[PDB]
Design a protein around this ligand. Sequence first.
Ligand SMILES: [Mg+2]
Lengths: 49, 147, 49, 37, 62, 218, 227, 342, 98, 75
Amino acid sequence: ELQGLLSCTLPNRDGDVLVDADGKAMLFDGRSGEPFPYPVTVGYMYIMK
Amino acid sequence: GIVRIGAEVRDGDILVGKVTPKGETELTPEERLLRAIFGEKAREVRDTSLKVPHGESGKVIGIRVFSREDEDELPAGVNELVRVYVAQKRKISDGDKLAGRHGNKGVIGKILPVEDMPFLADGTPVDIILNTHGVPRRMNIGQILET
Amino acid sequence: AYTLQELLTIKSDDTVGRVKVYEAIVKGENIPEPGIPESFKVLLKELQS
Amino acid sequence: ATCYGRSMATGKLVDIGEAVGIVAAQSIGEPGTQLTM
Amino acid sequence: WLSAASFQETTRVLTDAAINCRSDKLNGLKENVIIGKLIPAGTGINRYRNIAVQPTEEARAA
Amino acid sequence: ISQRPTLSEDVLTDNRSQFVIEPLEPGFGYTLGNSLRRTLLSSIPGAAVTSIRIDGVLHEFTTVPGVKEDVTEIILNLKSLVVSSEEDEPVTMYLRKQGPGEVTAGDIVPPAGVTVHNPGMHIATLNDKGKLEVELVVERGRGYVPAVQNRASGAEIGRIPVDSIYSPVLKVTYKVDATRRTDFDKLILDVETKNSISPRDALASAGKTLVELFGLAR
Amino acid sequence: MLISQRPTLSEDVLTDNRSQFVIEPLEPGFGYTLGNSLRRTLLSSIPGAAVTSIRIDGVLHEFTTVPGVKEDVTEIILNLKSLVVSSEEDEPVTMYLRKQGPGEVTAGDIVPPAGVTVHNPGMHIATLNDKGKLEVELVVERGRGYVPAVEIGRIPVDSIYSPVLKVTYKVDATRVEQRTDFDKLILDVETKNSISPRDALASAGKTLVELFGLARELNVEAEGIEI
Amino acid sequence: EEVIAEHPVLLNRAPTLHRLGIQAFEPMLVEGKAIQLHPLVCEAFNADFDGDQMAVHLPLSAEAQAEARILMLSSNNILSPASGRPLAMPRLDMVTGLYYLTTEVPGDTGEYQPASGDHPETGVYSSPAEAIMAADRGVLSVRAKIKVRLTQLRPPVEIEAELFGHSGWQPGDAWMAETTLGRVMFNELLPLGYPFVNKQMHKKVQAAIINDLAERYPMIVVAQTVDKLKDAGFYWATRSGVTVSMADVLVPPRKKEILDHYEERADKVEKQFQRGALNHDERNEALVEIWKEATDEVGQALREHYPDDNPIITIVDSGATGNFTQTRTLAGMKGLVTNPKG
Amino acid sequence: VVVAEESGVIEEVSADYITVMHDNGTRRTYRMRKFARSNHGTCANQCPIVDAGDRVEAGQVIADGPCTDDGEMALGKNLLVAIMPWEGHNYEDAIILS
Amino acid sequence: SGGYDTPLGITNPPIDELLDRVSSKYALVIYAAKRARQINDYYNYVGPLVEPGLQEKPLSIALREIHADLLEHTE
Ligand SMILES: [Mg+2]
């Protein structure tokens, strides 16, 4: 069910689906600028202090 | 002699001023010479005032005070008692301990500027970067599913 | 050896050596020679007890 | 020093002042929490 | 006897040492640690701790 | 051979704009887009509130009678104020209000040279007994400046320092198009600022900053 | 806005064609805004002339055997790609290298046509043994950066147009007693014999000044001042 | 900042199991309230960053400061005094960073391909700077096999014996090498004198390299080489593309059939025990052996179904961290579980 | 957390207390713990989650506590996480924050 | 000079070059410590024998002197 939901991801405000069905996404290195070569798993997690 | 509500105090600042009757034995030769020359034998005290501990600062929130002149319950020989409450707004910092719900704990090594942070295609930067090598060997895959 | 002696004598127990060390560092002089740990005197007195 | 052998950390011949007894005790007892039935 | 008393079974060691009127030579790592003396190892060995240092005459001229 | 590059602006909304830079060297669009985006996110000058002052309170951790939110929650609401100031000096705004009703940014009376760009933002909710009287010192700077302490300045007990977020831009990103005998890259910046300034002004400020910085290279 | 000052630039000369440069102090986060851009500009945006394609007589189909010399065609191309040359003709210009008899051919044995200049005459090319002769054609033209291999007897080579060879940067932290987190940029550059690292750095600076002046032209507005 | 310069401090973390639990460092003033600790000394301290605290002692006397700078300095103690193995060696992240950096991918972009017809090879490069230029452009991959002429690197024993005079080499001597740009850049960290490796850098290989460096080269050379290795390993671990997702944790495809088969075996064992033929302890031992076999079969099936570039397999097999039983437990089957008696 | 003991309409809401008016005419008032120190130094602070005039049922949450958000235990924050090694600043269980 | 790169102020002179001056690391420690407190006695007794830094720890000065072989020692 999680695998299926990873495909139904609604786009953002610009119509782009930022996260693919593997849960990964292409990120850009904010220091150099070149995009990171491989897709990296991104998402939202509950973090405590 | 009490700090004022709302004041900002730092390490070593005085919160409540207190003076204690000074023991005659510990009078240094210089103090003895002065008290014998001028004869100022009036209201002899020493500084035992409350101070702020090391590594502690913040805004003073409230002050509660109980006196013996006013009818309050205090232990034997205690004339006055004053509590001062100090609050601090602690932002997240290096070395502070974060953790998820799956046993994945960690302290904060570096907080990068929002530009140094890797960002998605539309420019949304990530908020926290968890290393990969930690995940598979602890046997908490629930964090990946939660993500 | 000198580190271990400094840790156990002039940093912990020497009552005349710690003040001497502070006085020597304040005036920029060399560190003096350590003395006798006071806890050893306490051990001797407790053995006498 | 000659009968003992080289020093593991330095790789050269063990110096004189070295206290090899405590080093040996530490070396034997440090991976002690790894022995299981 | 000091090392044995600090290690384990202090009461028995102390009784036995008092009966035999034991005099500790006071030359051991733990002994020198307890009494606050330089330990007989490493930089505490006589040949290392009593080294004399002075510049050479050729360098003392310059 | 090298054709002189051009910068052509597109517009999506009043606060968001796409820019197109072309032609560029192959593999050169990513680096330029990043060197622009970093300066856009970090060092764009703007204006924000530095310290506030409420009459009935002497510190941040208390409650104003009648209002619904505590002073700390009120400050967290004021953290969302987008303002623009031409004075470039400490200038004081005022706000008097009495309930019932609700206090918003439109109820604040800004002095000359400054203006609030979202009057509809919620600040506090007042009742019959609620009375809100606030002064807000507004200044102009860049980046993020944490609350200036009352020990650093000659401030007094009533002054409540607040965090200052001087960034006028909201979200910056970029994308490149590579084209492979004649290879070249076309860069597309996407800049969304707050209603304080237009993306044209933000990108112009970043361009001047980077020109001034690279001028020492020659 | 605000005012920043004292962003000095200094140089350490290791060799005549290689030097380090230090930009300090830079504001927080600006060590990486300048670092990658300067490197990519030095590498890919500088005008320079180099070899594009060549033709070697004697053997054309085998492409691996050549009489008179022991070096293969691969090593010949390797020796040729490292030849530094500067041309001002926009059109591709052909040069020729001819040498007979046993001996050693250098880059000075080449006859440069009008306009072009070879800067490494002492560079080794090939060695002719007994009864050997070498006659080769070269195509030299201008460009920027680096481009891979793009009439019988013709072979294209890898054109190294960039007058710089190797550029690498690093970022450290030195600042005032209030921040201690400002950035310092260290840029190690190693160039060819065409231009010194100084002139390459100045050219990259001018090209980037033009690039970002394209954006500054949109409006004359406030930004960080300098001293 | 003036009084701190060249005044070493002692860092200790309990439990101090061996003498490396206390080490001398040069203090550098940092912002914050945390002690920044070099990532290589962790193996000596058994220190992770899950909330660990360390203590700092300040030597005062000249003899104590000398003992700190000489006897207890961090860069002086690189080898375990127990087995002589390297402890300041790249540990886990760095490992992957180097394991990805030196492995050769057959058929990558820019890979050397022989000349066919009128098309040249385009697999040779004059200098490693030319390879760096070809890598900045999208043509050359770092993990692709190419042929480079190396002027500032030392060749192996056989290549130096064939092409050059044995024990004779000079900086600037040229030689052809068919390697990856990654292996070139990795050998660039190792000193000039060290022979080229051209091997996939499993953790054991770098352990052997550091053993050789400590056996032959000075201690300070090793202390700088390990720092260069740390930097390279981290930089390339960022770009090694190792993450974790639910799709990267692949369930074995034949798990259902294997479990059905071995549970059928166990059911036959239970049927045999139902008639009283099989002994109780014999039944327990038989079921234990059955489920051990099934666990290992599921592990083998998982090892077969997993690509060799999977991030889990890459992390485990590179020697960075973890073992294969953890992977068998994560995806596949954990197996038998302990009892109160054992 | 603050829970309604009896159904009714909220009569007044302040940062200090919440006064509700039951259906039988009786009043009730709940005082808010504001910036109260805990046994371990954490801050116990309560904030009303209802507005004046709302009709609440018996047992509804009227004000949130320290780690409560509209009625549920909110012990932390939802953060955008990317899982990748980054320049060793997340080496060995260290964490990198934006 | 050797293949080692430039040390960084506290790791110089390299320990591999200083251990060639004495028989053991302990003797080197005592060597440097006695020379250093002798130096500090001079400032309040001979030396420094090399050019001192603008502000330098006397231990580092003694280490540089030992590296320069400008002094003798006897066990
Ligand atoms: Mg731990």
